[PDB]
Structure formats: C-alpha cells, structure tokens
Design a protein around this ligand. Structure first.
Ligand SMILES: *P(=O)(O)OCC(C)(C)[C@@H](O)C(=O)NCCC(=O)NCCS
Lengths: 847, 163, 94
C-alpha cells in the first residue's frame, strides 16, 4: 500500500519542519520524527540552518517508541542496572525467528516426542529491549542515526543448558564501559539472560556513536585484565612485592618462596580527559598454585588512585610476570568449509521477529537521511546467518555444542548480497574448539569477522594398566613438551631425594641391577625412608606387620634391586613409570587445551590412579609416585619370590569364544571355580574385559598352567558343559572333569616353580605380571592399605565437582556418586565397617 | 605389451612388507603372520581388518596359517581389483611422496608410453613401489621418473617381464 | 548436604574405592557399557603406551553395538595416544 513518509511544511514563520514517518512500528500507529530547520532569508547563500538544540532528544524519543514498551524517560544513571521484563518463549516465536534467519537445524523444528530448543541468537530477541536501553541515558548523549553496532557476542555459562520452548527468561543489562575515543563514543553493554534465578548466558554488545564527545566526567571503563603469573624464585622478588602497598596478603608472614602466584585482576577506570584517568581502582584476588595445580586465594590487590596516567599494577605484572592465555593456537589452521549465503531482499521479517525496528533497515528515506548506501541489512541478521552455518558445519548440526560466538560488524551489507564465509578451526580453549570465520561480499571485501567456541564431541579418557611398559616410553614427549618435563622432573627429584634413585634413568636405559648406597647424611636419610616402609596385613583379626627390605637395617650401607631382563619389568618401578607417563601425556593434552571440562574418565587396574591424578588432581605428583611405588613394592612382598625377582603366581588372558562358540563366560566361570577347588591352589577370574572374547584369570602359575591345558582338551574333543548340565546328567559332570584337571595336576606339579606358560589355543599368558592382582588372595592387605591412603589423599584436594558423574571406578563399574544408593552398592559387594557406619548414620550428614 | 591381471600373492606380500616398513625379500612368504610380527598384540587385528576389506572375506583362523596358502585361497575368489585401501595407499604415496603435479594419471601414462606396460602390469609395478616407498618426497620430476626407471626391473625380476 | 560434608563423604568413598579396587575384580565390561551406551561417547581417547583398552573398545563395539551405532548413526572414533597423536592434537598432514 501507499502511505505518507515525509511531510515538509512551516511550523512557524521561519521554522521548516520535516516530519519523517516510520509506518512499521510496534502497535501499527506510525511514529514521526519532527526534524526542524531555521529558515533565515537574510543569509541568501545558506538560508536554511538546522536547529541542533534538543536534536538528539527528539531522535531518542522516536527510537524509544520504536524499541521500548515503557514511558519515555532519559533521566536514569548509566551506572545503574537496567531491568528488562520477563520473556516467555513459544514455538511460534522460534519458528518465525529460524525462518527469518534461515537456520534449518532440526533442534529448532517441532518433531514428535522431542522438546523444541531456541537458538542462542534468540538471546538478542529476549535482551534487545534491555541491552539497547543502555544507550538512551542523557549522560550517554549521541545521535542515534549515526549509531553503529561494532560487535555482538554470546557466551553460555558453563553447565547451563541451552534455551528451550516454555522457558520464562528474565533479562538484566548493565553498561560495562563508555569511553570517548577521538572519532566518537564507544558503549560496551553486558546483558545477562536468567532462567529460574540461575543465569543462563551473557550477551556482549559494543555500540559506537560517531562524533566529538568531551563529556569525560560521564565516561568510565571496567576492563577485566588478562591473568598474570609470577614465579617467586628469590627473596629479592618477595621484598619487591612487600614494597607494593596494593599487594595485601591475608597472612602477613605467608612463605612466598618457590611459589607460583596468579593475579586475576579487574580494573575500574574513570576518565578526566583522553590520556589522564581521574580514578584508577584495579583490584582482584591473589591465588597461589598448590602442589595439585589447584589455585587458592591467599591475598587481594587493593590499588586505588586519583589522577593517574596508567595502572602501575598491570605495568608491574607485565614486566615482572607472564600472561596465562587460555586460547592455545593449533600448529596450522584446519579449513572446515567455505560457504555462500544470501542476505534477503527485504529486512521486514527480521525486524518483525527480533524487535529491532530501526528505520535505516526498512525506510529508504531514513537510510538516505543517515548517509547510508540504501536500506542496509541488519548486522544482527548476518551474525545469526553465519552462526547457523558454523552450527551446521563446525558443530555437525548440533546446537548444544555452540558455547560461545562473537562477531565484529566490519562493513555494512545491502540486501540481495551474496556472502562467502570461510570457516577455520584455528585454536582450542578449555577443551572447546576455537573456530574463526571471515565473511566477504562480491567485491571480495571483509564484512563480518568473528569466532565461535564449539564443544568437542562427547569424550571419555581411559588409562591403561600394567600391560606393556617398553623402555623409553614417554621420553620422545619428555624431550619436546614442557608440562611432561615438569611432571617427570618433579617425580625424578622426589625419587632421588627420598629413595635415592632416578625413575627417568630406569625408564630410559632399563638397567638389570640398580644399587642404592646409604653413605653420607643423605645416605642415612634415604636408608631410614627404606626401613620405614612396612607390609601391614591382617591375619585372624591381628596385625602381622612384616617390614619390607628386612636385610636393610641400622648397619646396612647399601641395597640392590635384582631383575633378569630389566628393572622396568619389576612391579615397584613399572607402576610409577607407567603412571607418570600417562600423567605427562595428559598434562601435555591439558596444556594444549584439548581436555573437555565434562569428559568422563576411567582407568584399567593401575590406570585408575593416573586417571584420578590427571582428571581430578586429587593427588600431587610427589604423593602419586609415593603411593604407586609403595603399592608396587607391597606387591613384590605379597607373594613369596626367589633370588632374581620371580614368583609362582601370574595371569592368563582366557578367550572363551576361541575354545567353542557355545562356551559362554558362565561355563568359563564354572570350570575355573572347579580347577581352584580341586588342585587347592589359587584360580579366580580377576579382569572381565571384552564379553565372550577376553577374560583374565590370575593365580598359582601351576594352577593356571592346568586351566590352559583343561581348555586345550575341551576344544580338541568339542565336548560341551552347558548341554551336559541342561540336556544330560545334571550336576554329576563336576566329578567327570576332576580327572581332566588331575591329568594336568601331575605334569604342572612336576614342572619347576619358575615354569614358563605355553601360548595355548584360547589362553595366552601375560608378561611383566607375577602377582595375582584383584584376586581375593591379597584381600587381607586392604584394611591397612585403606589407612595408608588416608594420609596421602587429603580431603582438601577432593573436589566432588570433578569426580561426580565423570569418574567410573573399576570396583563398581558405575559413575561415582556421593548418593546413599552408591554407598549401599559399594558395601553390598565390599563389606566395609566405615561404609556401613556412613550408611546407618546417613541422616546426620544430610544436616 | 602383454597384459596380466594382478594376483593375491604380490598384494598380500606387499601389504605386510609396507605394514612392517621392511623390504619384500627380508620377510619370507613361507612364514605365518604371528611368527613374522612377533607377539605385539594390536597389529594382528590391523592386518586381519586389512585382509578383510580388500579380499572381502578371510579364512576361519588366518593369523596362525601361513601366507603362501592365504595367497592360494585369496586367488580362488580374487577378481583382479587392487583394493579400496591398496588404491588409498597409492593415493597417499602419489600425493605425499611425488612433487606438485606428478599425480596418479601421469605415473600411469609414463609406464604406459616409455615401457609399454598396460594397466594389469602397471598395477603390479605400483604395489612394488609402495613396499619400496621413499622416506620423503622426491622434489624434482626427473627423480620421480628415475624412481619409476627402477620399479620396472623389480616388477620384472619378481613376476617375469622383458623390457 | 553441605559442600564441606559432601567433600568428606567423597574422600571416604574414594579412599574405600581404591582400597578394595586393589583386591576386587576389574569390571571393565560394565565400565565400557556405561561410557559407550549410557553416555554415547563419540571420541574414546586411550592414554597409555599401547592401544590395549582401544583394542578392547573396538572389539566391544563390533561385538554388541554395531546395530546400535548404525541405528542412531553415531561415528565412534577410538584414538590411542601412542598411535593417533595427529587426530587427538588436531594436526593433520598438509
Ligand atoms: P591384543 O589386544 O590383540 O592382545 C590381547 C591381549 C589379551 C594380550 C590384550 O588385550 C591385553 O594385553 N590385555 C590385558 C589387560 C589386563 O587386564 N592386564 C592385566 C592388569 S591386572
């Protein structure tokens, strides 16, 4: 239809009034901006002059009616928190938004039995009526026609689930910073979307009023500083820090020597002019690294100033410290896709849905009056369109995987433009992929830069147990990486000072005999550390504390570890080597930022320790290698050995699938149970690995060399066990099979005690292992080992956040929970007095 | 010259020699998978998965049984198609070890023209070049032709060809 | 449950989890069934010198999740740290 847009007339005798009308408004009723112009007939060259007084307020008054649902009042403080009204999300608003931006992601479409989610771009729909209210205040005076949107950014809060349909989202907005540049005034806004009290996501928006502002009394700037690290190696560095009035520790005599301090500061500047701050107010907590890499608040910064020319906190931290960058760049960017998208013919649909009824994107006259090249495309449309390309290509058409997304509006886009967006995987941050992009127009001019943060696909970390441990493992990584260096060095130092050997040496060149000498002050100290180690085990409800290293006493001047092929295959050195190597590997992965904040983790047998140290940081390196060595050394003594370091115990990797397809793991559990009862010796299933393809039975090498020959007879004669207990003589067959066991009982008994196990048909014997790990045999050494951990795993290092849901113990293959049902499950399969006590007294802990 | 479809014997011997990163003559055809690889657990499933994807089917217990009779039983059902991964190994040899332009269709046309060798013989030449893969890329084009001046006599020595 | 009480209980559970784990069978079947079926993990990154647990996953996936992986059309990558550095570190060959 045809409507009036402009009405030029004479308000008075010499006041030309050019009413400019917007016919696309909230409630149908058109909104007029009465631009005035003095007409002076004496100045015949320029008879018309603009009335510049009350000009910016007329404009604002228009845009208020176009944008805000409240009464017109420009008298409120910019410092104060702007409170947007609650927004209820409906399936029609999402439907209309997604078509308006061309985001055809099945997450936002109504499918049966699956609730509709709202795109994260829908945050600017919710927040626009608050965020844009941040540039109205009288103190933030500007011409809204010249207003430029420089940059818009979203950031989901970690944990918080994406927006749904039927969610009542509250909005807060606040001006972070408003600074007069030479070329105009920048207004940085920080909207917060909130659902059921809990904040959901942050929206950042930078606006630019072009012009010349000198109202510096109304400006400010709340910057957040990059984290600065410091290494207090010397006592000069302690004295320099003690000089600084702003370095305020909670404890005055806290020992800063050989410590790492982090300085998480946020500044609050107010300006006097362009280059002089009228009030600097840098503050923030001072954290110290613990030996678990956990940081704890020990102090504060409390710098305050009047007139200044700089922040002497930031300056000092720069010169005398290093920045911690969370964004780690890959070696080479990885191209993902190059994509073409088209801006729409008309901007009316995006204006309708978003609520951004800025005339410049719809009315040719307003765009012409603001010196724009025609009805420009909404920058917020380009943003949303590119974010839907990122979502489809980088996040493989999953919404939930997009956790942040910024974009700078470099240049204006006209309608019916064809855009080429290059998308690159350039970096990592906290396990989220860092994807840069760059949108160009047909002139090959950059129009929209930006970067997205994209979760990695659901990850789990599994840590290997005492399998293979070939020499030089992790040493290629220990040469290159800096975090692996830090890990090995720490352990090797603790091992040299404590037990007088180098683990690094042992891993590198795997010596056959390693002699520890107890000469000197250091020598006697090390020899005490060897003699202190005990083998506390329970017999008949009575402690029989044998002392490990019985030969090491007050008068001994040495001790030698023996092996056959090498000491890296001896348990007490395999275990610390393996654990360290894993921990190093992980610490390299974490330094690179490849570790999801929400990754599940488990560890097979030994791995469980490495896992917990890696993911949960529940132990220090020093405490880890202490525990894993002591356990390793307890396993060298938990079985009677010989004079080289070999025992009459070991493990076989049974493959019940290989003997017979009928031979299910029940018939495997049956036969191993029967061979153990018969020969009296130890047989038991210890590792349930792959189903009907790999189980591991540990026990007495002779009793395991009978089972590998009992299951090398069933294969050759294809004689079933289930089809005899079901369809034949019931229960009798337990007496039949005793002859087959007793056949191998008198070839294995004759054989020597260090007998080599022969790779059978469906059984392979493992290598390195000589102790029946995970068996009942060593169940006795659990009650005093429990007590050993209690002074190593200190409760101040146990973050429940980092274990709950993600950790899967081997004991109870179930995500670790601090719920009563989990305790009840632990007790019901491991009769413990302290666990039963916690179960019975569960109520008082709740309070 | 005279065309001949590729066998399952040179493909099986080459794929194993490429996997172990060793010369074809170093590995005997006579020995079995488990004796040659020596214990190392993961590599058996990788080789079986390999013999599963080119040949489509594998015997009941191929790991312990020798390679000469695995080439016997694979030739029974073999059609003359090199394999999906055998062409994928030749896709990464050409793209990563030959210079900027020496593609698969120019190393096809050189053996066809200079030597005369047709597709059934050139497919046999390309497999012997894989188990004699150079450590790095040959920068010059004249070394990508002097390399292909070597693998024509080695194919001929193995199978029997006059050039 | 207060945070300082939850910390204490967790520290007890963890202590008496490691204590028994030592001397109670490893239930790595149920463990795989959790992190492969329950959590629908895509990337299974194995940290260690050889791909033993990677090998165990890859074999468990073929044995009892091939029809489940096909149905829900999810592409389970199994990466060992030893042999698949380039896929874990995102460093492909140009
Ligand atoms: P590979 O996977 O082809 O060989 C099979 C294997 C049984 C040798 C292998 O999976 C393995 O080394 N498993 C042993 C894991 C284990 O439970 N070790 C004992 C820790 S107490």
């Amino acid at each position: 239809e045809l409507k009036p847009t402009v009405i030029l007339k004479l308000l008075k005798e010499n006041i030309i009034q050019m009413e400019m009308i917007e016919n696309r408004t909230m409630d149908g009723k058109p909104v007029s901006l009465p631009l005035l112009y003095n007409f002076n007939p004496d100045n015949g060259f320029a008879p018309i002059s603009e009335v510049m007084e009350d000009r910016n307020q007329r404009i604002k008054e228009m845009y208020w009616k176009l944008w805000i649902d409240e009464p017109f009042n420009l008298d409120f403080d910019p410092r104060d928190v702007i409170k947007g009204k609650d927004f209820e999300i409906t399936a029609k608003e999402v439907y209309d938004f997604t078509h308006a931006v061309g985001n055809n992601c099945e997450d936002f479409v109504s499918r049966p039995d699956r609730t509709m989610l709202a795109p994260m771009d829908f945050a600017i729909v919710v927040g626009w009526r608050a965020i844009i209210k941040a540039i109205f205040p009288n103190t933030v005076d500007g011409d809204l026609l010249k207003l430029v949107h420089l940059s818009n950014g979203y950031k989901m809060i970690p944990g918080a689930k994406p927006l749904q349909v039927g969610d009542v989202v509250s909005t807060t907005a606040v001006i972070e910073s408003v600074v007069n540049q030479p070329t105009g005034k920048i207004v940085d806004v920080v909207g917060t979307l909130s659902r059921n009290g809990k904040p959901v996501m942050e929206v950042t928006s930078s606006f630019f009023y072009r012009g010349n502002y000198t109202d510096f009394e109304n400006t400010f700037q709340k910057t957040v500083e990059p984290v600065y690290q410091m290494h207090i190696k010397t006592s000069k560095d302690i004295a320099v820090l003690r000089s600084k009035e702003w370095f305020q520790l909670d404890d005055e005599d806290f020992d800063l020597l050989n410590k790492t301090l982090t300085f998480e500061t946020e500044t609050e500047v107010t300006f006097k002019n362009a280059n002089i701050f009228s009030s600097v107010k840098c503050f923030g907590p001072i954290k110290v690294e613990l030996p678990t890499k956990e940081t704890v608040e020990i102090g504060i910064v409390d710098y305050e100033a009047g007139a200044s020319h700089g922040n002497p906190v930031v300056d000092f931290l720069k010169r005398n410290g290093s920045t911690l960058e969370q964004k780690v760049n890959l070696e080479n960017p990885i191209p993902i896709a190059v994509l073409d998208s088209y801006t729409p013919s008309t901007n009316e649909p995006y204006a309708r849905v978003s609520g951004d009824l800025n005339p410049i994107h719809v009315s040719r006259h307003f765009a012409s009056y603001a010196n724009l090249p025609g009805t420009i495309t909404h920058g917020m449309f380009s943003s949303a369109s590119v974010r839907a390309l990122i979502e489809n290509w980088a996040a493989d058409s999953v919404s939930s995987r997009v956790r942040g997304y910024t974009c700078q509006f470099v240049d204006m886009v006209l309608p019916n433009t064809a855009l080429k967006t290059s998308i690159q995987h350039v970096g990592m941050i906290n396990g989220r992929k860092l994807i840069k992009f760059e949108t160009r127009n047909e002139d090959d001019v950059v129009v929209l830069t930006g970067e997205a943060e994209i979760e990695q696909p659901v990850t789990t970390f599994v840590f290997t147990g005492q399998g293979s441990q070939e020499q030089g493992m992790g040493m290629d990584l220990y040469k290159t990486s800096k975090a692996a260096q830090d890990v090995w060095n720490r352990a090797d130092n603790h091992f040299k000072d404590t037990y007088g050997f180098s683990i690094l040496d042992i891993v590198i060149n795997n010596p056959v005999n390693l002699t520890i000498h107890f000469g000197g002050e250091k020598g006697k100290r090390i020899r005490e550390n060897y003699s202190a180690m005990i083998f506390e085990t329970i017999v008949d409800g009575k402690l029989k504390t044998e002392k490990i290293f019985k030969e090491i006493n007050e008068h001994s001047t040495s001790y030698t570890f023996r092996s056959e092929k090498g000491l890296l295959s001896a348990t007490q050195f395999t275990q610390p080597a393996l654990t360290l190597m894993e921990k190093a590997a992980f610490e390299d992965l974490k330094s690179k930022g490849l570790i999801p904040a929400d990754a599940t983790f488990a560890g097979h047998s030994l791995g469980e320790y490495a896992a917990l140290a890696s993911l949960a940081d529940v132990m220090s390196i020093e405490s880890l290698v202490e525990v894993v060595f002591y356990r390793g050394m307890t396993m060298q003594v938990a079985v009677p050995r010989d004079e080289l370091g070999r025992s009459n115990y070991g493990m076989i990797a049974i493959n019940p699938g290989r003997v017979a397809a009928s031979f299910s793991q029940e018939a495997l559990q049956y036969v191993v149970e029967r061979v153990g009862k018969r020969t009296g010796w130890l047989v038991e299933i210890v590792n349930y690995n792959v189903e009907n393809q790999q189980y591991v039975a540990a026990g007495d090498l002779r009793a395991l060399d009978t089972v590998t020959n009992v299951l090398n007879f069933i294969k050759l004669q294809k004689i079933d066990i289930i089809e005899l207990q079901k369809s034949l003589s019931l229960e009798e067959v337990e007496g039949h099979l005793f002859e087959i066991i007793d056949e191998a009982s008198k070839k294995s008994a004759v054989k020597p005690r260090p007998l080599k196990l022969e790779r059978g048909f469906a059984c392979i014997p493992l290598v390195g292992i000589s102790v029946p790990f995970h068996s009942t045999y060593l169940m006795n050494g659990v009650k005093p080992f429990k007590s050993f951990l209690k002074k190593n795993i200190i409760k101040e290092n146990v973050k429940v956040a980092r274990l709950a849901g993600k950790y899967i113990p081997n004991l109870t293959a179930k995500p670790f929970q601090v719920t009563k049902e989990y305790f009840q499950d632990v007790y019901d399969l491991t009769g413990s007095e302290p666990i039963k006590e916690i179960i019975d007294n569960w109520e008082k802990y709740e309070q | 010259i005279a065309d001949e479809p590729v066998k399952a014997s040179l493909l099986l011997h080459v794929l194993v020699a490429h996997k172990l990163k060793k010369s074809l003559d170093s590995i005997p055809m006579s020995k079995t998978i488990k004796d040659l690889v020596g214990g190392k657990s993961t590599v058996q499933n990788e080789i079986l998965g390999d013999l599963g994807k080119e040949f489509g089917t594998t015997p009941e217990k191929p790991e312990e049984t020798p390679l000469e009779e695995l080439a016997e039983t694979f030739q029974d059902t073999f059609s003359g198609a090199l394999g999906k991964q055998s062409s994928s190994l030749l896709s990464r040899l050409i793209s990563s070890k030959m210079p900027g332009g020496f593609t698969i269709t120019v190393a096809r046309k050189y053996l066809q023209t200079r030597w005369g060798l047709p597709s059934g013989r050139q497919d046999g030449v390309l497999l012997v070049a894989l188990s004699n893969e150079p450590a790095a890329r040959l920068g010059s084009e004249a070394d990508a032709k002097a390399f292909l001046d070597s693998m024509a006599q080695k194919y001929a020595s193995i199978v029997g060809v006059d050039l | 449950m207060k945070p300082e009480v939850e910390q204490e209980l967790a520290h007890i559970l963890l202590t008496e989890l490691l204590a028994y784990q030592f001397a109670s069978p490893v239930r790595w079947i149920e463990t795989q069934d959790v992190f492969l079926k329950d959590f629908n993990t895509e990337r299974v990154v194995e940290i260690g010198p050889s791909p033993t647990l990677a090998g165990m996953a890859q074999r468990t996936l073929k044995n009892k999740y091939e029809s489940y992986d096909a149905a829900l059309s999810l592409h389970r990558e199994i990466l060992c740290y030893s042999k698949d550095a380039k896929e874990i570190y995102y460093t492909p060959d140009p």
